Amino acid sequence: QQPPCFPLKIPPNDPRIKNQADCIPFFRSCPACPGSNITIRNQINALTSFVDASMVYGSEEPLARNLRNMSNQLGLLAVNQRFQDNGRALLPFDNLHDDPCLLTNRSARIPCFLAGDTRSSEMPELTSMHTLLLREHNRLATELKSLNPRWDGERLYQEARKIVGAMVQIITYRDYLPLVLGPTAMRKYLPTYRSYNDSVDPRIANVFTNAFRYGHTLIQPFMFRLDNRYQPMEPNPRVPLSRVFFASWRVVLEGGIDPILRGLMATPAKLNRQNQIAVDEIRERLFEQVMRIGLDLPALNMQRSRDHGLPGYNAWRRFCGLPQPETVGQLGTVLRNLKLARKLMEQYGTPNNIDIWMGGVSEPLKRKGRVGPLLACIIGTQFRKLRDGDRFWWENEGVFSMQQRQALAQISLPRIICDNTGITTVSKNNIFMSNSYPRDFVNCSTLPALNLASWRE
């Protein structure tokens, strides 16, 4: 347990790990001030605290410059020089001292992908999203260059970056959050846009990095791929999630990203229930091939919350203005469950010691939502701070013209997917809701395309 190692102790009678002397690997976060007898320990955020599509353009000058294709004056982004997806762009490769992508399968010899985020190679889905965004940026830059032949590479790159960031913000705040918080919490915590506060702090809260891990309860135990007719693509249509962690060779040498996107569109998510929190695939076989032994994602979340020194469940309930339980009965009433409340009370000993993540995922879901009142409050507060404190918000005056805003308000994720890939059948509007084929799938020729005529100069 010598620093900076904080391994997870193994309790007795553990179903998986029989040896008590073993421990789960764990590394403490980097302190803000390395070595101090005065300052309270604080963590470091290495990425911009804005919704600015930093996943594709990076967050530092050297990496961002390396990500650009500085060989012509088209203002494009670097693509893979060795592999193609049916004649379409692919993410550039990365050079690392230790590469888990090569460790996953030594026969293929496919290194990890290079993008604005170092974790963009965890699964084929993230690589598919990053490649889709890169293709969209390249198409926007090419269209702008054709429309405005007098511009240079830097201007085209900046304009395409601005458009991509605006699209990300629009899609997020118009489709994702209303389905997360629910209409009541959406109206309570994220009202209509008024103007630009410069007095709102846009920094990311420490608790948020845990409160946003609720998606770990939406993880399905399989990765699904579908062919053109939205049928199970063979061989291996449903592949285990333990065999896709850091496996980039499933993108280059397994038919590209189109089947992955098709399976992404036409597969229901996992519902969060008080007796079904997280699947065993991520709870017992996380990074099994990459590491010596598998990890435990909920346990890792709890240990990270403890490492950051986040307060308990009751402190965050009081911070959000909600009643704070103290006994078994009050906790059961709050959770609308007595068996789960009894188990939590036995394990922790008092509600004040319940971890933020576990308490948040134990709370019942809101009406037409996916989070409890505490998690919904935290997420809504953080995203409202991000939106109101951002000077370059698309709806803010002086950033986009009225015609540009009107054109941008008509975008949609299915339009981007159908334009940037070979997919001809895409789901209806609110892609985060349609999951049944062919109940709510259209021919993609009816969806309007973004009009760039307002960008002429």
Partner: protein, 100 residues
């Protein structure tokens, strides 16, 4: 100020470092450490948190989260794209580095 910066600097005119990259988080609540400043709960065996012993995170995951995988149910009003966009937005927002 025609376009965004790449490091987030000078987005807020009054405080240019606010919301930039490679900066410390903002604490909505005071930190709760075992010794007070720089030690987590469970680092030193035999210590108690508010009068109760600290439970093992692995034990908590073992006795609560675990459930048979054949009882899993799907969501009739969501899709996997929901989870994927959640992850993409999260990777957009924050990332906490750790030493090698």
């Amino acid at each position: 100020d025609k376009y965004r910066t790449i490091t987030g600097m000078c987005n807020n005119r009054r405080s240019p470092t606010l919301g930039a990259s490679n900066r410390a988080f903002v604490r909505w609540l005071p930190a709760e450490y075992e010794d007070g400043f720089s030690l987590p709960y469970g680092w030193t065996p035999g210590v108690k948190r508010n009068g109760f012993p600290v439970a093992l995170a692995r034990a908590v995951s073992n006795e609560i989260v675990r459930f048979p995988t054949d009882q899993l149910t799907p969501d009739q009003e969501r899709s996997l794209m929901f989870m994927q966009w959640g992850q993409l937005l999260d990777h957009d927002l924050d990332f906490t580095p750790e030493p090698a």
